[PDB]
Amino acid sequence: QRNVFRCNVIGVKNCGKSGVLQALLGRNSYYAINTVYEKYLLLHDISESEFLTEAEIICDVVCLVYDVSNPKSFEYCARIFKQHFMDSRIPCLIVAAKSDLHEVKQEYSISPTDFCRKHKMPPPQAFTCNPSKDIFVKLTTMAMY
Numbered sequence: 001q002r003n004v005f006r007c008n009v010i011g012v013k014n015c016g017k018s019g020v021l022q023a024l025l026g027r028n029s030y031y032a033i034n035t036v037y038e039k040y041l042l043l044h045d046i047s048e049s050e051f052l053t054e055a056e057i058i059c060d061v062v063c064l065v066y067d068v069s070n071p072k073s074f075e076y077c078a079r080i081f082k083q084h085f086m087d088s089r090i091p092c093l094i095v096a097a098k099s100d101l102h103e104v105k106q107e108y109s110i111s112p113t114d115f116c117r118k119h120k121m122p123p124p125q126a127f128t129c130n131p132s133k134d135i136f137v138k139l140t141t142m143a144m145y
């Protein structure tokens, strides 16, 4: 019965990934850990690159992070999902980051809400560093399945 869970935080460069790790540590290093309700959630900051290694794919739960101010950020999340996680035993969560900024329409063929519903993912979770613990509990909860 594991109580320590690993989560890969994946998204476009400067989409607010490091903010998510710092938020878990309680703020407004590419790994961050803290207790979640007692469970331990270990986040991994996966920098944007050309491809992902099989060491960056394995985890207990995936946190796909896209930027609501960057219309090109969700396409990356959707592409990575279908390539590495759509055909996997790994639960996935999509987070609409920088929520406090204005939501410009994402340039993808499918809406985020539709895309999530299409692949049995929870609806897109809004998040900002300006911090709630909601996503980390859900990430941990989804890891406990």
Ligand SMILES: Nc1nc2c(ncn2[C@@H]2O[C@H](COP(=O)(O)OP(=O)(O)O)[C@@H](O)[C@H]2O)c(=O)[nH]1
Pocket (backbone or CB within 6 Å): 011, 012, 013, 014, 015, 016, 017, 018, 019, 020, 097, 098, 099, 100, 101, 127, 128, 129, 130
């Ligand atoms: N408005 C807003 N800006 C943010 C938030 N989180 C991060 N940023 C800004 O986004 C920029 C890049 O974020 P960063 O953490 O470096 O993302 P990363 O490069 O993917 O790790 C930073 O200069 C932050 O000021 C947020 O929740 N709200």
